[PDB]
Amino acid sequence: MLIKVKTLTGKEIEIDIEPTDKVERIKERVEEKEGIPPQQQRLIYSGKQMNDEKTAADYKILGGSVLHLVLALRGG
Amino acid sequence: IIRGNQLQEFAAMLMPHQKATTADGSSILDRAVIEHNLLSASKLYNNITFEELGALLEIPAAKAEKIASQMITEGRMNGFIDQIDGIVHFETREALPTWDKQIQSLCFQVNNLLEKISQTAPEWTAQAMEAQMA
Amino acid sequence: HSNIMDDPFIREHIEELLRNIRTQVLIKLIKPYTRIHIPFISKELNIDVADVESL
Amino acid sequence: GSVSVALHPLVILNISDHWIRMRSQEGRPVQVIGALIGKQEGRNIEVMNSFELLSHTVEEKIIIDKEYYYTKEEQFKQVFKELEFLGWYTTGGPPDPSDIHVHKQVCEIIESPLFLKLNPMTKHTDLPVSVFESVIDIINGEATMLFAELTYTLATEEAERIGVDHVARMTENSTVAEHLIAQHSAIKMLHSRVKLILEYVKASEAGEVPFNHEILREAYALCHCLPVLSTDKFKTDFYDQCNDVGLMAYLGTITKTCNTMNQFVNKFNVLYDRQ
Amino acid sequence: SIDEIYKYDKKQQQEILAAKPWTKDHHYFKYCKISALALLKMVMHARSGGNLEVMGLMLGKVDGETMIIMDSFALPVAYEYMAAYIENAKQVGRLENAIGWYHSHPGYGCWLSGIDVSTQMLNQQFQEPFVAVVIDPTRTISAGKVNLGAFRTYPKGYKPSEYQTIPLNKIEDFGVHCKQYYALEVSYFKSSLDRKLLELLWNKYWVNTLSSSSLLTNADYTTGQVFDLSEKLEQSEAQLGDKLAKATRDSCKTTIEAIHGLMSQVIKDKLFNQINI
Ligand SMILES: CC(C)n1nc(C(F)F)cc1C(=O)Nc1ccc([C@H]2[C@@H](O)CCCc3cncn32)c(-c2ccccc2)c1
Ligand SMILES: [Zn+2]
Numbered sequence: 062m063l064i065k066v067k068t069l070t071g072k073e074i075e076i077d078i079e080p081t082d083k084v085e086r087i088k089e090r091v092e093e094k095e096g097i098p099p100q101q102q103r104l105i106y107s108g109k110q111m112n113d114e115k116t117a118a119d120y121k122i123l124g125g126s127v128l129h130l131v132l133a134l135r136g137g
Numbered sequence: 138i139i140r141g142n143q144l145q146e147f148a149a150m151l152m153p154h155q156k157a158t159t160a161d162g163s164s165i166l167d168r169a170v171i172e173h174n175l176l177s178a179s180k181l182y183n184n185i186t187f188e189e190l191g192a193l194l195e196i197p198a199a200k201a202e203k204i205a206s207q208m209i210t211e212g213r214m215n216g217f218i219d220q221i222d223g224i225v226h227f228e229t230r231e232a233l234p235t236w237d238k239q240i241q242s243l244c245f246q247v248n249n250l251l252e253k254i255s256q257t258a259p260e261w262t263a264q265a266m267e268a269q270m271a
Numbered sequence: 272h273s274n275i276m277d278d279p280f281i282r283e284h285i286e287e288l289l290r291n292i293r294t295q296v297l298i299k300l301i302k303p304y305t306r307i308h309i310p311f312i313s314k315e316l317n318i319d320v321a322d323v324e325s326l
Numbered sequence: 327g328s329v330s331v332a333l334h335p336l337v338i339l340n341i342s343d344h345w346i347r348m349r350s351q352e353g354r355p356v357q358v359i360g361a362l363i364g365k366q367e368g369r370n371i372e373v374m375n376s377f378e379l380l381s382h383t384v385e386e387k388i389i390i391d392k393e394y395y396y397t398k399e400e401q402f403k404q405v406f407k408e409l410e411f412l413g414w415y416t417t418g419g420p421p422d423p424s425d426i427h428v429h430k431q432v433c434e435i436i437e438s439p440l441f442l443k444l445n446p447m448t449k450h451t452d453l454p455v456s457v458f459e460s461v462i463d464i465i466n467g468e469a470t471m472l473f474a475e476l477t478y479t480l481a482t483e484e485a486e487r488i489g490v491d492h493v494a495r496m497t498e499n500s501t502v503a504e505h506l507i508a509q510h511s512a513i514k515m516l517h518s519r520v521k522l523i524l525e526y527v528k529a530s531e532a533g534e535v536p537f538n539h540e541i542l543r544e545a546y547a548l549c550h551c552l553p554v555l556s557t558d559k560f561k562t563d564f565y566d567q568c569n570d571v572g573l574m575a576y577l578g579t580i581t582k583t584c585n586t587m588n589q590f591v592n593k594f595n596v597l598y599d600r601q
Numbered sequence: 602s603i604d605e606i607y608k609y610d611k612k613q614q615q616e617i618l619a620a621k622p623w624t625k626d627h628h629y630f631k632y633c634k635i636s637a638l639a640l641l642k643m644v645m646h647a648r649s650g651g652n653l654e655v656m657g658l659m660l661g662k663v664d665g666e667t668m669i670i671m672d673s674f675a676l677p678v679a680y681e682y683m684a685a686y687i688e689n690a691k692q693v694g695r696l697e698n699a700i701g702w703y704h705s706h707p708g709y710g711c712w713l714s715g716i717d718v719s720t721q722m723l724n725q726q727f728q729e730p731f732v733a734v735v736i737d738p739t740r741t742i743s744a745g746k747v748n749l750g751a752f753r754t755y756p757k758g759y760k761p762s763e764y765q766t767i768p769l770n771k772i773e774d775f776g777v778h779c780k781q782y783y784a785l786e787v788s789y790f791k792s793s794l795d796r797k798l799l800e801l802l803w804n805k806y807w808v809n810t811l812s813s814s815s816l817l818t819n820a821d822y823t824t825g826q827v828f829d830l831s832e833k834l835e836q837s838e839a840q841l842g843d844k845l846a847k848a849t850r851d852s853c854k855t856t857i858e859a860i861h862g863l864m865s866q867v868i869k870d871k872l873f874n875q876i877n878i
Contacts, residue, residue: 069658069690070728071698072618097727108688110681131687132727134720137679209303221306232563233817236555240812240873246548247519250541254526258535265522335802336641342795343638343672350607351696375642380694404677404686446795453801480805484742485648487809489641492747493791494803497861505861509868512810516872554873564870567816571863578856581834585849588841 066091066104066128075125083116091130100136105129138174138193141167161200171196175204176214179227187223290326293318297326329476331371331440333456334483335490337362337415340376341444345417355446357383359428360415361395362440362457365408371440372481373457376415377402388428392435413440413459419447421458421473429471433462441473523548603793606634606669609696614662621729627759632667633732633751633785637796639673640789644747646675647705647738654705658690661700663730669790671697703734709771711735711750711764718781721754732785740766744819751785766825811869815862826855 063077066087076090088099104111106120106128120126148156148166156164163171174194178185190205191197205225208214216227255262276282293316300315301307313320341360349355361379364372377398382389402409414432416425421443432439445454458473482490497504527545529535623629635643639659646655656678661670672695676683690699702724704717713721713735724731735750748764755761763784767775791797816823830851837844 067691068728069687069699070618070730072728095727101723103684105684105688108685108692110684129688129691131684132723133684134723206300206303210299216303217305218303219306220304220308220311232555232557232560233567234814236560236869237812237814239551239554240869241808243548243551243554243873244516244808244811246544246551247516247523250523250544250548251519253538253541253544254523257538257541258526261526261529261535262522265525266518269518269521269525336645338799338802339638339641339796342799343636343792346792346795347607347671347695350604351609375645378693401686401689404682405675446798448798451801453799453805480802483645483648485644485738486641487806488741488745488747489644490800490803490806491745491809492640493637493789493796494800497857501857501861505864508810509865511804512807513868513872515804515807516811549877552873552877556874556878560874564866567866568863571816571859574859575856578852581849581852585845588845 062123062125064122064126064128066130068130068132078117080121081116084111084113087128097130097132101133103131103133105131138177139170141195144170163196172204172208172213175208179214179216182227183229184224184226187225190225293326327479330369331373331457331459331476332479332481333371333373333442334375335480335486337373337376337442338444338456341415341417341442342446344378345444345446355417358415358417359383359388360442361398361411362413362415362442363402363406363409364412366410366412366438371412373412373440373442374409375406379414386424388424388431390431392431395435411436412438413442413457415442415444415457417444417446419443419445426471606790606792607671609662611696614698617663618730623729627756627761628783630663630666630668630732630753631786633749633787634667634669634790635734635749635787636661636669636671637789637791639670640747642673642675643703643734643736644738644741647707647736648742650705650707650738652707652739654707656702656704658687658699659701659703659734660690660695660697662697663700667788668700668730668732668785670700673703700730701732701734703736706735706737706750708737708739710767710775711737711740711748711752712767712771712775713750713752713754713778713782714771714774715778718754718778721752721782722757725754725756733782737764740764740822744822745813745815746819746822749787751787752782753785754782755780763829764825765829766821811872813862813865815865816859823855823859826851830855 062080063075065073065075067073074091074094076087076094078086078090084104085099087104088097088102091097091102092099106126111120144166148164151166156166158164159168171194175190178190178193185193187198187202191201194201196204202218202220202223202225205214205216206218209216209218214227216225218225276285297312297316300312309323310320313323316323316326318326341358344358344360345355348358359379359381360376362373362376364374366372379395379398381391381394399411413436414428416428418425421441425441425443429439429441440457440459442457443454444456448454455475456478458475460471460473462469462471463474464471495504495507523545526535527542530537530542639661643657643659646657649655655675657673657675659670659673661668661672663669674689677686706712713733717733717735721731721733732751732753735752737748737750741747761780761783765772765775791800830848833844833848833851837848
């Protein structure tokens with residue numbers, strides 16, 4: 062519903078979504094928060110990188126899951 | 138250094154094609170053994186003359202220098218040849234680096250001798266150093 | 272001699288050869304030496320002592 | 327070696343940093359539990375980099391939180407290809423029954439576990455002796471296994487040696503003193519070793535200890551080797567080095583004098599000639 | 602008791618992170634305090650790759666103008682493995698977060714490459730406290746001293762030498778990307794107490810110290826230092842007609858190192874050569 066994404070340094074951002082929202086929507090929300098392009102940014106939950114095609118059905122938290130943001134260069 | 142007194146037996150089990158001559162009166166067997174002797178002698182010598190190199194490896198002077206220069210230019214052997222005085226210089230130590238390694242060997246002898254004292258008399262050794270500093 | 276040094280396209284360039292190969296032999300021969308004898312070089316290069324100095 | 331245990335200096339620093347971080351975090355010193363890994367070659371220990379393995383220390387009992395260690399196993403396997411679990415470390419004095427219980431828990435994971443007990447509260451000169459590991463004594467009835475201390479070695483690589491030297495006192499107390507204290511300590515320990523060897527020689531001469539024909543022969547060889555490099559080429563090289571350092575000092579005393587003269591003329595130009 | 606570097610104060614860290622004092626002034630960070638464990642693990646990983654290149658993250662905090670580093674963990678490598686291993690920072694129980702990344706230059710000096718400066722620009726842009734460490738394994742092994750590489754970069758579109766040993770190849774990359782980053786003064790901190798007590802294992806060596814073979818181990822380092830000092834002094838002279846103070850300091854340190862080596866050699870000669878004459 063309303064999740065928090067933390068960077069490596071520890072900066073926390075609180076972004077609000079809906080259960081049917083996509084991971085591209087997550088990246089766009091982070092873009093509107095700071096300005097990170099979606100292709101230069103990686104999202105991790107439970108130590109596993111999210112795939113870019115699944116609509117957060119197994120990421121059901123209902124209580125603001127903590128996401129991990131990792132900056133990466135374009136295309137590696 | 139392998140002499141001729143321990144090579145006659147080895148020629149017995151050699152295959153017949155391995156006893157061929159290299160158009161110089163020397164078989165294949167006693168061609169890689171003079172190269173081996175030359176490389177091994179580079180570790181026991183800092184510099185050797187042509188005459189004494191041939192008095193130890195046979196083949197006195199015609200090909201003793203030729204083999205020495207042939208091993209070099211190929212990376213097989215380190216050294217340089219001064220043809221005017223007929224001396225092959227193998228490898229020399231720069232004094233100061235030798236001083237450090239000789240000091241290290243001296244300190245290692247102290248440590249090794251220390252273990253021997255403790256092994257023989259563990260009771261006498263233990264009480265020794267504690268009162269020594271105080 | 273009648274198969275190599277016949278046409279002018281190879282005879283003219285035979286002078287450039289027999290000198291490059293001699294140069295390569297000379298370079299390798301003097302590699303492990305700090306002081307070498309010029310007459311000693313001449314016997315290996317199969318040329319005159321004066322020609323060794325010019326080379 | 328008789329027992330083939332080789333500890334690395336990085337492990338000791340790891341345990342010290344762990345203990346200090348926990349002590350600062352929780353205010354008071356607290357017992358910590360770890361996990362030593364390394365390379366085993368049949369009869370070799372060779373401990374290396376250790377990781378946290380926090381587990382639990384609840385009340386008086388240690389719970390089996392080794393699932394976290396299981397997750398850490400594949401993590402450390404990604405950066406350490408040739409490294410495997412060997413044992414665990416702790417902070418305290420003599421072994422305790424709680425240590426026995428934790429060791430029993432650890433033997434479930436591995437067949438040959440060690441037990442390091444780095445003591446941070448020690449106030450005696452020689453270093454706390456690392457690991458008290460055991461082959462486990464079995465008697466009729468209860469196992470009641472104890473720990474049979476065996477010796478350890480401090481084998482270290484070149485990078486570890488350079489790092490340890492950098493952390494140690496090397497270059498308010500001036501650089502001359504810091505550079506000279508290291509030499510003073512090294513010469514002091516060498517002098518102690520030589521003095522104890524001389525004491526053994528004197529004891530053998532008087533008759534306190536039995537006459538060992540080989541120790542005195544080695545001592546005679548050591549005495550004969552004492553004048554190291556006394557050649558004329560060594561003296562020439564040493565004097566060349568001394569002259570080079572003297573010139574390098576002259577070039578730089580000149581620089582300092584030039585700097586001070588520049589400061590003096592800067593102060594002089596604003597005091598007498600006001601232009 | 603000093604210490605006080607530990608005991609991570611969460612409230613102060615959040616306050617200093619929310620204040621963001623380095624946004625106003627670009628030259629805020631000037632001092633980098635690497636820990637003993639940080640150096641040990643960094644150098645071990647750097648040498649555990651030989652001529653190959655290694656890279657990992659380094660954890661720490663920020664206090665005023667200084668950046669303190671308490672720990673550092675290696676990485677498996679660009680693929681998913683590195684990103685999966687990054688979760689270690691928040692998986693373990695540790696309050697130090699992450700402060701930067703370290704990466705080795707095996708034989709290519711200590712400078713920052715173009716890709717390196719671009720990654721540092723990105724990291725600083727979206728993760729405000731970040732520093733890059735560019736230590737060199739081959740140089741510390743050969744010369745016996747550790748060379749540091751704290752090389753925080755400048756922001757994009759902003760305008761405002763030491764280890765110049767790269768002979769031919771990569772010196773071109775050095776020249777183009779030279780004003781895009783500024784070095785940080787590295788000042789090591791020892792926690793004292795436990796680690797100061799346990800540093801007696803260095804005294805256990807006692808043989809590499811007694812036979813150090815200095816003044817030839819790092820002869821190339823001293824020649825490079827003198828080569829840098831030459832145009833440092835030329836720049837001081839050109840400005841004069843305070844760079845002169847910096848040149849004098851560099852000359853003093855180089856001369857002090859040379860005299861320390863000579864003192865060690867003299868002590869060794871008195872200890873060993875002047876016995877049984
Ligand atoms: C901190 C890490 C995760 N990171 N974050 C971001 C940023 F985009 F977020 C970006 C990065 C990141 O891995 N960068 C990077 C870039 C370049 C190299 C190599 C590259 O040029 C190839 C030539 C050698 C070289 C000399 N100097 C940097 N390199 C490396 C790298 C260094 C050592 C081992 C493996 C890789 C890492
Ligand atoms: Zn780089």
